[PDB]
Design an enzyme around this catalytic site. Structure first.
Site, PDB file in Angstrom:
ATOM      1  CB  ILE A 102      11.111   4.535  -6.727  1.00 51.95           C
ATOM      2  CG1 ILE A 102      11.064   3.766  -5.412  1.00 51.95           C
ATOM      3  CG2 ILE A 102      12.506   5.169  -6.829  1.00 51.95           C
ATOM      4  CD1 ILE A 102      11.506   4.573  -4.200  1.00 51.95           C
TER       5      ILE A 102
ATOM      6  N   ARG B 150      -3.004   4.723  -5.140  1.00 54.65           N
ATOM      7  CA  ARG B 150      -4.053   4.119  -4.289  1.00 54.65           C
ATOM      8  C   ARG B 150      -4.234   4.848  -2.945  1.00 54.65           C
TER       9      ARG B 150
ATOM     10  CG  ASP C  80      -7.798  -0.434  -6.118  1.00 62.25           C
ATOM     11  OD1 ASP C  80      -6.919  -0.865  -6.895  1.00 62.25           O
ATOM     12  OD2 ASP C  80      -8.471  -1.189  -5.394  1.00 62.25           O
TER      13      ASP C  80
ATOM     14  CD1 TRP D 157       5.795  -3.500  -6.870  1.00 67.57           C
ATOM     15  CD2 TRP D 157       7.786  -2.633  -7.439  1.00 67.57           C
ATOM     16  NE1 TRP D 157       6.768  -4.438  -6.578  1.00 67.57           N
ATOM     17  CE2 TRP D 157       7.996  -3.935  -6.923  1.00 67.57           C
ATOM     18  CE3 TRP D 157       8.896  -1.895  -7.883  1.00 67.57           C
ATOM     19  CZ2 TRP D 157       9.282  -4.517  -6.825  1.00 67.57           C
ATOM     20  CZ3 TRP D 157      10.173  -2.468  -7.789  1.00 67.57           C
ATOM     21  CH2 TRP D 157      10.354  -3.770  -7.265  1.00 67.57           C
TER      22      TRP D 157
ATOM     23  CD  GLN E 290       9.308   2.425 -14.657  1.00 75.11           C
ATOM     24  OE1 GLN E 290       9.438   3.652 -14.732  1.00 75.11           O
ATOM     25  NE2 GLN E 290       9.134   1.788 -13.495  1.00 75.11           N
TER      26      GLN E 290
ATOM     27  CE  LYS F 166      17.097 -11.388 -17.213  1.00 77.19           C
ATOM     28  NZ  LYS F 166      16.527 -12.403 -18.140  1.00 77.19           N
TER      29      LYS F 166
ATOM     30  CE1 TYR G  80       7.885  -6.415 -15.193  1.00 75.01           C
ATOM     31  CE2 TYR G  80      10.035  -6.711 -16.186  1.00 75.01           C
ATOM     32  CZ  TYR G  80       9.278  -6.355 -15.119  1.00 75.01           C
ATOM     33  OH  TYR G  80       9.988  -5.945 -14.007  1.00 75.01           O
TER      34      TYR G  80
END
Lengths: 358, 358
Positions: free
Chosen positions: A13, A39, A57, A82, A112, A116, A145
């Site tokens: 996104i 990927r 990948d 992600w 990034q 949370k 993170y």
């Protein structure tokens, strides 16, 4: 070209917003060359864009070396894939190990993460209260993170590179490939309701209906990452990223019903939360028939919607983050969150992923 | 002078910020001449400023005519007097009737109201939910702010003048004269606690401890009113004004305790709200002794603090307002609300209204 971006996660996104925003006239740092890594084979939407697509990948070390080590001209890395433990760390390490020794004009690594991870569902030790600021210390609770930050700091430090850590709120956005996407999930539920002649029934908690929430437009995340990549005053900072306002799910819900031309049923006093994932578990064939009946882009229900993700959103509260640090550093970008949500609905319609309004 | 401001309520919290901000180098619309109107004789702080002070009870029609009708050069009216029915309407009508026929270069009338009158304590018909936006229609419930709007619209319309309606959130600010001031009230309570060797005990509700709240720095209100007074794109708009962020009383409370070097006692689960006004009812003599012991500016407890006003604040919630309209019109002014609160404490100390920190 002045700057050369490696966008890791270009089909996601935020990654898809970076590819677009990096190419706009008068983008800071521009003109930008853009390498986009993901990927899957290059999607048709992205093939027509001026992006150099690299199928890779990044969890495979060899392949990452094979495909990224020849890219000698990279100036800026944007790591925006992600984040679903050792695999996320490995993927990021792979990227840095493959590019740092080869890209002699490399300047900056943008990492990034998020405010949370999955609304904090995985977080004994008393958590920090909101509004979340970037100066709050790390608490002795494991965090994927924090492991990525540590790799960023170590690798940038040793190689004289600048770093950024961007912590987006819940993302509003849409592009033809990315799942775990809240707006898509809710549009799909609205579409099923409409197809079945049922009302848009809110399945969430009381508290998530009425509490203040926030979010961030994918394009604003791209603008914020670019700003920190080019503004020297912004570099070597952890920075939150949200739209600058607050909203409530109850208002989003009414808007959603309005946009689909269906009746709303809001939170009903006394009724407990029910799982949207449960409500939708036997709808895969219904979704196939909706795609056919409306000539939509063929998607599978499990690919376009993550009902479980909406369920977490609808039992969450007290997650507001602050933009004071960014604003005090001179970043005054914002979005009207209600307008951003509607724009994502419009975009899904324009691209034919959900039926038209009329 | 390019522009000529009539600041009605110059000794109030916002009025005193307008007098200062209107005189800064490079203020839009400048150089400004400033007339400041208030009921009291000119305070010593303001006598040393380049403000033309007009002592006037604007509730007295004759006196308003006598003192304002000779001011032929006024270009902009800023009506920022604290609003405590027919009297507020009369005062504003008096101002407009006295200036409009006499000031032939009059351009603009700025009217300051608020997001809520006394947190909405006076508001059968179901109220609008928050986040409060300016497009929400008027509901058939009497409102002193709506009566002032109506006079603004009628008088500006008939006379070819532009108008603004500014709706500040709870104001953080301080100047030597203004009461009904939240920061002063809380600093006074902190000062008494400290004097008596007691902890800073939170007397409020659970919900007001933990809920998101917002507010506005008096200087930001001045900047926002000036912007709407000079930006043609901003004119003839109702506009909210807050600091652009949110905070919680629980965090303000900890900060307050820290600034005074005293122990905090936060909200205690199960303990009901108690009246701060009740806790302080027999403290008038204690305040006299604190003023003496610390050589403070002599104030009476009833003049510097409004404990009843803090009590309303501490049983309020769900009052967040939006700045999206202002931002979308190009006003990107903000403050960090936690920094704003502390700056008011610093200012009260600097001016010797409360004891020094050490």
């Amino acid at each position: 070209y002045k700057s050369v971006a490696l966008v890791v996660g270009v089909t996601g996104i935020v990654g898809s917003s970076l590819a677009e925003v990096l190419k706009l006239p008068d983008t800071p740092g521009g003109p930008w060359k853009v390498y986009g890594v993901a990927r899957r084979p290059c999607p048709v939407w992205l093939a027509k864009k001026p992006v150099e697509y690299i199928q890779c990948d990044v969890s495979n070390n060899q392949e990452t070396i094979s495909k990224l080590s020849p890219l000698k001209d990279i100036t800026h890395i944007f790591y925006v894939s992600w984040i679903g433990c050792q695999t996320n760390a490995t993927m990021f390490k792979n990227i840095l190990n493959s590019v740092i020794p080869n890209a002699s004009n490399l300047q900056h690594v943008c990492l990034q993460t998020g405010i949370k991870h999955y609304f904090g569902i995985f977080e004994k030790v008393v958590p920090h209260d909101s509004p979340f600021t970037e100066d709050l210390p790390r608490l002795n609770v494991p965090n994927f993170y924090h492991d990525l930050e540590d790799i960023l700091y170590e690798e940038t430090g040793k190689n004289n590179l600048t770093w950024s850590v961007h912590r987006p709120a819940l993302v509003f956005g849409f592009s033809p490939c990315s799942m775990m996407n809240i707006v898509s999930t809710l549009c799909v539920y609205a579409t099923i309701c409409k197809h079945e002649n049922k009302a848009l029934v809110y399945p969430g908690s009381k508290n998530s209906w009425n509490c203040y929430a926030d979010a961030v437009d994918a394009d604003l995340v791209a603008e914020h990452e670019i700003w920190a990549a080019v503004d020297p005053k912004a570099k070597n900072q952890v920075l939150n990223c949200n739209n600058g306002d607050v909203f409530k799910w109850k208002h989003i819900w009414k808007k959603l019903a309005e946009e689909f031309g269906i009746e709303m049923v809001g939170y009903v006093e006394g009724k407990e939360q029910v799982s949207l994932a449960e409500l939708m578990k036997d709808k895969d064939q219904v979704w196939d028939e909706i795609v056919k009946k409306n000539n939509l882009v063929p998607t599978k229900l499990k690919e376009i919607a993550a009902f479980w993700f909406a369920d977490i959103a609808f039992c969450s509260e007290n997650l507001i983050s602050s933009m004071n640090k960014s604003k005090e550093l001179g970043f005054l970008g914002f979005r009207n969150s209600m307008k951003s949500f509607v724009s994502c609905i419009d975009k899904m319609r324009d691209y034919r992923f959900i039926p038209k309004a009329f």
